[PDB]
Enzyme design. Structure first.
Site, mmCIF file in Angstrom:
data_model
loop_
_atom_site.group_PDB
_atom_site.id
_atom_site.type_symbol
_atom_site.label_atom_id
_atom_site.label_comp_id
_atom_site.label_asym_id
_atom_site.label_seq_id
_atom_site.Cartn_x
_atom_site.Cartn_y
_atom_site.Cartn_z
ATOM 1 N N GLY A 164 0.835 -1.209 0.000
ATOM 2 C CA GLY A 164 0.000 0.000 0.000
ATOM 3 C C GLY A 164 0.853 1.236 0.000
ATOM 4 O O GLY A 164 0.671 2.093 -0.923
ATOM 5 N N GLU A 195 -4.485 -9.113 -7.076
ATOM 6 C CA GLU A 195 -3.236 -8.531 -6.727
ATOM 7 C C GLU A 195 -2.674 -7.451 -7.683
ATOM 8 O O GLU A 195 -2.143 -6.497 -7.118
ATOM 9 C CB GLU A 195 -2.230 -9.748 -6.634
ATOM 10 C CG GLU A 195 -0.747 -9.287 -6.310
ATOM 11 C CD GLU A 195 0.111 -10.503 -6.045
ATOM 12 O OE1 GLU A 195 -0.204 -11.267 -5.099
ATOM 13 O OE2 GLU A 195 1.126 -10.761 -6.788
ATOM 14 N N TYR A 240 11.583 -15.345 4.176
ATOM 15 C CA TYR A 240 11.828 -13.972 3.577
ATOM 16 C C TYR A 240 13.068 -13.398 4.344
ATOM 17 O O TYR A 240 13.824 -12.587 3.700
ATOM 18 C CB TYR A 240 10.604 -13.096 3.583
ATOM 19 C CG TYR A 240 10.583 -12.437 2.177
ATOM 20 C CD1 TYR A 240 11.414 -11.423 1.794
ATOM 21 C CD2 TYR A 240 9.748 -13.021 1.251
ATOM 22 C CE1 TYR A 240 11.315 -10.954 0.450
ATOM 23 C CE2 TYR A 240 9.630 -12.580 -0.047
ATOM 24 C CZ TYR A 240 10.344 -11.502 -0.397
ATOM 25 O OH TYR A 240 10.429 -11.139 -1.799
ATOM 26 N N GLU A 258 26.538 6.400 -17.249
ATOM 27 C CA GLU A 258 26.872 5.914 -18.555
ATOM 28 C C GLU A 258 26.342 4.529 -18.744
ATOM 29 O O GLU A 258 25.881 4.208 -19.869
ATOM 30 C CB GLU A 258 28.375 6.020 -18.810
ATOM 31 C CG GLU A 258 29.279 5.159 -17.820
ATOM 32 C CD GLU A 258 30.716 5.144 -18.308
ATOM 33 O OE1 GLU A 258 31.507 5.941 -17.787
ATOM 34 O OE2 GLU A 258 31.131 4.234 -19.112
ATOM 35 N N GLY A 307 4.166 1.064 -0.512
ATOM 36 C CA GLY A 307 4.790 0.459 -1.685
ATOM 37 C C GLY A 307 4.346 1.037 -2.941
ATOM 38 O O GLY A 307 5.034 1.821 -3.605
ATOM 39 N N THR A 339 -0.501 -16.280 -7.558
ATOM 40 C CA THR A 339 -1.749 -16.975 -7.426
ATOM 41 C C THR A 339 -2.950 -16.043 -7.467
ATOM 42 O O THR A 339 -3.912 -16.286 -8.189
ATOM 43 C CB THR A 339 -1.965 -17.797 -6.139
ATOM 44 O OG1 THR A 339 -0.868 -18.681 -5.924
ATOM 45 C CG2 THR A 339 -3.297 -18.578 -6.000
ATOM 46 N N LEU A 347 27.145 4.821 -12.962
ATOM 47 C CA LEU A 347 25.808 4.395 -13.183
ATOM 48 C C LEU A 347 25.104 5.294 -14.303
ATOM 49 O O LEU A 347 24.153 4.787 -14.926
ATOM 50 C CB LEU A 347 24.916 4.398 -11.854
ATOM 51 C CG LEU A 347 25.491 3.621 -10.594
ATOM 52 C CD1 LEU A 347 24.479 3.624 -9.432
ATOM 53 C CD2 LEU A 347 25.857 2.156 -11.009
#
Lengths: 164, 427, 439
Positions: free
Chosen positions: C144, C183, C224, C254, C146, C179, C252
């Site tokens: 959320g 989502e 996790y 180039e 996120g 699943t 980062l």
């Protein structure tokens, strides 16, 4: 000969009302009669979208609490008197001050509008479509009230002329 | 910390209430007279869950000791975990347990509302941390039926703005012939549906059937069976306040229980076991957990959703286990119940898990079901009613103590709307 | 030189930074507090005392990254742990939560409440972006907060920091492969907003990393917590091999000039070599070819677009550790001239590559240890119509059978925004069918 022309003109005024009244009274009745469909769409939305919180604040003006007081609204909704309080603002029994608050302000502003309130929610848009149609039937029952008062006055004059 | 208050209504809402308090205090290191036996994490943080520490490591309860009459308070104040703290927490006042729902929902309810409400208004503003209220209830007579329904209308008027979660024990749902009482008891249901936000209903006979079989004793004392329920509950509330990545909170958990907007009915099930309270082998591994969930017989409330669809679920675990053995087992036990969970959504799954055991338990869990195609329940209330609607000589008590017939027909309609809404959930 | 301030959100995102930080510490030999007793030794940074001396230093030691958590326990793991002087407590933030997995919640409902404190930290973090490159951000993409808060914030950072580099590091299964039917609902709206406002995102597939952990790395408990250490060891074998070491050290900016050559963030899917059981248990050294063949091993390469198909544009592979020139040429050349790999007909060169020269020096115990060679891998397929089509298919798939949008509107989001986003995914699917059939 005059009385029967009285009688025709009263019939011609009611014929003018008759055009607009049966569709608007079906919508204005449908709400009032608290059908399942209508109530479910009302009893929805924990956080209204932005144009819909503007709308709710206006519904709570009809409730009496001036703004989108959720905690007040949550309590009174699940109590039988919330719809009665609101439907008392229907028909010519909307106040002309509220009809002008609505028309010169809210329905002179895109923010409360069908377009914006139907994009914001699929429930809320048709409630605005019923609310504005009920607010124009309200206004019609005020500003087309001279037509109804003319159909009334042609009946009252006709009765006065029976007794003269 | 969470700082929860328990509202325990009637003698049944106090039975469960109490046989939670012993165990909950004990696992969070509150000792019978309010002292300290902690020094584990929850018996230091988590700890003020229904409590506060105060006065040189003694424990004031946040859920204070309230009762109606003194001998019941004597059992609460002898405790064992209910003796904790100096006199301000001990409260009692009036009495009840009457009959006639109409009397109880008006005249004989209102004085007892009046005795409850003042102390609630004084307590309710004065809890800062309070995340929500736990509720438990009794259907005991005209008080627990009539008054309990009057009471919750006043409580929800008073508090729309708080989180109230209602656990309710029932004599097996609507299994017995009922006289003219159907038109009263739907009006009781009416007042339950218009004043409740999260509901959980627990079947005495299923737990006695679980007692006869699983727990291996033919005598089903419900003060014992309400301990098991509650010490199992010890593994739920504190699970989700221990750490773990699936241990979700408010705004998620709300819509997880309500997939479709109208008031749901949740049913607790049973989860790891072959016994608890008999044998020295009681079951605890991931396969042994999945077996009662994906059965049918452990679950509460005689009105069977299960035939019509198997709908939504959750399981709250405690104990170290392999997360992918859980989801591998879950794939296989879900390959049993498939589309037909609700064929708009093939497979309905949700879980929450904490690494750290509960009590002498290595692993334990709970199971939660929801309600679709149970319309049979609300046909049944109408099918019992027929005889002593026809031969009625009994409605007039309820009516001449304050009821009237429009409310009975308005109630009847929501019992038929219920029949439709389950028909429609089977759809 | 060295890297550049790293910002971390989310349950994996903070701990991915926590495990990578353990590897900086382990490589440095750093003390929790001091003082560190060697001349000099590197890991955070090339100085080693006042600890961390992470380029950022003095005070009670000024931090070179920021952790926003909700748990005292991670804060104790710094403050009475290792890391105690390697951050100061003024920037160790620990908050409260309320969970939704809804975009509207994260953006609005709690989003306008919590923001100000962390906005005041972010404005200062932009003001004092040491390393100077840009924002490197962990995510926290599908929740959320996120999904919606990162909408709100990324649009804010794209607004006010338009010249500043932005690299987004996210864990996310491949679309429609999870699943749950519903989502995609909160995330497809972020995917719409970051269709316009993002240009670099590093993606890791959660299902693929869990199976890789279960069978390939062969772990009895995937958790996790172990995935956090796992993806922190992936990110470390980019970040500590290009930062300032015996390496080719590709800035980062180039690199992003190679990542996006043309309008739209052309993110690449990411994978790692030695996420396997023999490497775990300790294996032969392996050549530049032998370790590409390690990253080839069954399921370490994604089957999203089918094993060798989907119109390859390029593959980028990043060869850490001591290296021999001839062998590295062999490594890239053999997959191309065996030509199992399906490339685009417009350009089947495959010259994109990175090589660095520094063996891992960390103490064995986790999933990464002292080795002289490794590789990280990035797939770019042009036939990714499939990703956008599977966001549009999976969204409609609850709908086609029952109504559901009304709830997210009930959290404060617009109802037509979802229709249009579904449509943009389905529009984009067309555009990507154009590039995945090519000229």
């Amino acid at each position: 000969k005059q009385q029967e022309v009285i009688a025709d003109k009263q019939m011609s005024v009611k014929e003018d009302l008759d055009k607009v009244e049966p569709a608007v009274i079906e919508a204005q009745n449908a709400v009032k009669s608290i059908k399942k469909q209508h109530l479910v769409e009302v009893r929805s939305m924990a956080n209204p979208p932005a144009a819909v919180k503007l709308a709710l604040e206006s519904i709570c003006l009809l409730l009496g609490e001036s703004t989108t007081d959720w905690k007040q609204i949550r309590s009174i909704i699940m109590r039988e008197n919330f719809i009665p309080t609101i439907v008392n603002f229907s028909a010519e029994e909307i106040s002309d001050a509220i009809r002008e608050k609505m028309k010169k302000n809210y329905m002179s502003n895109p923010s409360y509008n069908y377009e914006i309130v139907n994009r914001a929610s699929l429930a809320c848009g048709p409630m605005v479509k019923w609310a504005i149609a009920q607010l124009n039937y309200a206004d019609m029952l005020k500003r087309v009230e001279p037509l109804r008062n003319e159909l009334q006055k042609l009946e009252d004059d006709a009765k006065d002329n029976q007794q003269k | 910390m969470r700082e929860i208050v328990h509202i325990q209504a009637g003698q049944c809402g106090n039975q469960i209430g109490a046989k939670f308090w012993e165990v909950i205090s004990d696992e969070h290191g509150i000792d019978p007279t309010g002292s300290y036996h902690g020094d584990s994490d929850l018996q230091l943080e988590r700890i003020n869950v229904y409590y506060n520490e105060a006065a040189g490591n003694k424990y004031v309860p946040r859920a204070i000791l309230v009762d109606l009459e003194p001998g019941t308070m004597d059992s609460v104040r002898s405790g064992p975990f209910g003796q904790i703290f100096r006199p301000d927490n001990f409260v009692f006042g009036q009495s009840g347990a009457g009959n006639n729902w109409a009397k109880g929902h008006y005249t004989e309810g209102a004085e007892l509302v009046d005795s409850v409400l003042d102390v609630v208004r004084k307590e309710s503003e004065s809890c800062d941390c309070l995340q929500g209220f736990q509720l438990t209830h009794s259907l005991g007579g005209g008080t627990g039926s009539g008054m309990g329904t009057l009471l919750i209308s006043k409580i929800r008027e008073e508090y729309p703005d708080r989180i109230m979660n209602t656990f309710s024990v029932v004599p097996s749902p609507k299994v017995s012939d009922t006289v003219v009482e159907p038109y009263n008891a739907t009006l009781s249901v009416h007042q339950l549906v218009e004043n409740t936000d999260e509901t959980y209903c627990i079947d005495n006979e299923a737990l006695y059937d679980i007692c006869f079989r699983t727990l291996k004793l033919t005598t089903p004392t419900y003060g014992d069976l309400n301990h098991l329920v509650s010490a199992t509950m010890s593994g739920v509330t504190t699970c989700l306040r221990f750490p773990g990545q699936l241990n979700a909170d408010l705004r998620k958990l709300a819509v997880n229980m309500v997939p479709f907007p109208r008031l749901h009915f949740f049913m607790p099930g049973f989860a790891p076991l072959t016994s608890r309270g008999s044998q020295q082998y009681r079951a605890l591994t991931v396969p042994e957990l999945t077996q009662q969930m994906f059965d049918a017989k452990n679950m509460m409330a005689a009105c069977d959703p299960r035939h019509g669809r198997y709908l939504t679920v959750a399981a709250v675990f405690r104990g170290r286990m392999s997360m992918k053995e859980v989801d591998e087992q879950m794939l296989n036990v879900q390959n049993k119940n498939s589309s037909y969970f609700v064929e708009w959504i093939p497979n309905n799954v949700k879980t929450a898990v904490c690494d750290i055991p509960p009590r002498g338990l290595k692993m334990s869990a709970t199971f939660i079901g929801n309600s679709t195609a149970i319309q049979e329940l609300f046909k049944r209330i109408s099918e019992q009613f027929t005889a002593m609607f026809r031969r009625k000589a009994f409605l007039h008590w309820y009516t001449g103590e304050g009821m009237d017939e429009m409310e009975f027909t308005e109630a009847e309609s929501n019992m038929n709307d219920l029949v439709s809404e389950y028909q429609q959930y089977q759809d | 030189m060295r890297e550049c301030i790293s910002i971390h959100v989310g349950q994996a995102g903070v701990q991915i930074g926590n495990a990578c930080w353990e590897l900086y510490c382990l490589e440095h030999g750093i003390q929790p507090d001091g003082q560190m007793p060697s001349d000099k030794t590197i890991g955070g940074g090339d100085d080693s005392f006042n600890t961390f001396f992470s380029e950022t230093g003095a005070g009670k030691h000024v931090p070179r990254a920021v952790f926003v958590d909700l748990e005292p326990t991670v804060i104790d793991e710094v403050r009475t742990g290792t890391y105690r002087q390697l951050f100061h407590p003024e920037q160790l933030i620990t908050g409260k939560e309320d969970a939704a997995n809804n975009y509207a919640r994260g953006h609005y409902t709690i989003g306008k409440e919590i923001i100000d404190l962390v906005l005041d930290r972010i404005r200062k973090l932009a003001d004092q972006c040491t390393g100077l490159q840009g924002f490197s951000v962990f995510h926290s993409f599908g929740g959320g907060t996120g999904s919606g808060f990162t909408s709100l914030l990324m649009e804010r950072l794209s607004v006010d920091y338009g010249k500043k580099s932005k690299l987004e590091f996210s864990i996310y299964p491949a679309p429609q492969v999870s699943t749950a039917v519903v989502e995609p609902y909160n995330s497809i709206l972020t995917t719409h907003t970051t269709l316009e406002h993002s240009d670099c995102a590093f993606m890791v597939d959660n299902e693929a990393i869990y199976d890789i952990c279960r069978r390939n790395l062969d772990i009895e408990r995937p958790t996790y917590t172990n995935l956090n250490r796992l993806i922190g060891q992936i990110v470390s074998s980019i970040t500590a091999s290009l930062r300032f070491d015996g390496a080719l050290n590709v800035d980062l900016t180039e690199f992003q000039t190679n990542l996006v050559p043309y309008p739209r963030g052309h993110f690449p899917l990411a994978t790692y070599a030695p996420v396997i059981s023999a490497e775990k248990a300790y294996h032969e050294q392996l050549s530049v070819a032998e370790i590409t063949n390690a990253c080839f091993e069954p399921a370490n390469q994604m089957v999203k677009c089918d094993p060798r198909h989907g119109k390859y544009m390029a593959c980028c592979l990043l060869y850490r550790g001591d290296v021999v020139p001839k062998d590295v040429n062999a490594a890239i050349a053999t997959i191309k001239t065996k030509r199992t790999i399906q490339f685009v007909d417009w350009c089947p060169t495959g010259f994109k590559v990175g090589i660095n020269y520094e063996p891992p020096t960390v103490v064995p115990g986790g999933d990464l240890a002292k080795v002289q060679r490794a590789v990280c891998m990035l797939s770019n397929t042009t036939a990714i119509a499939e990703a956008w089509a599977r966001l549009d298919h999976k969204f409609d798939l609850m709908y086609a059978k029952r109504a559901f949008v009304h709830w997210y509107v009930g959290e404060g989001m617009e109802e037509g925004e979802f229709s249009e986003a579904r449509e943009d995914m389905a529009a984009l699917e067309k555009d990507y069918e154009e590039v995945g059939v090519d000229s």
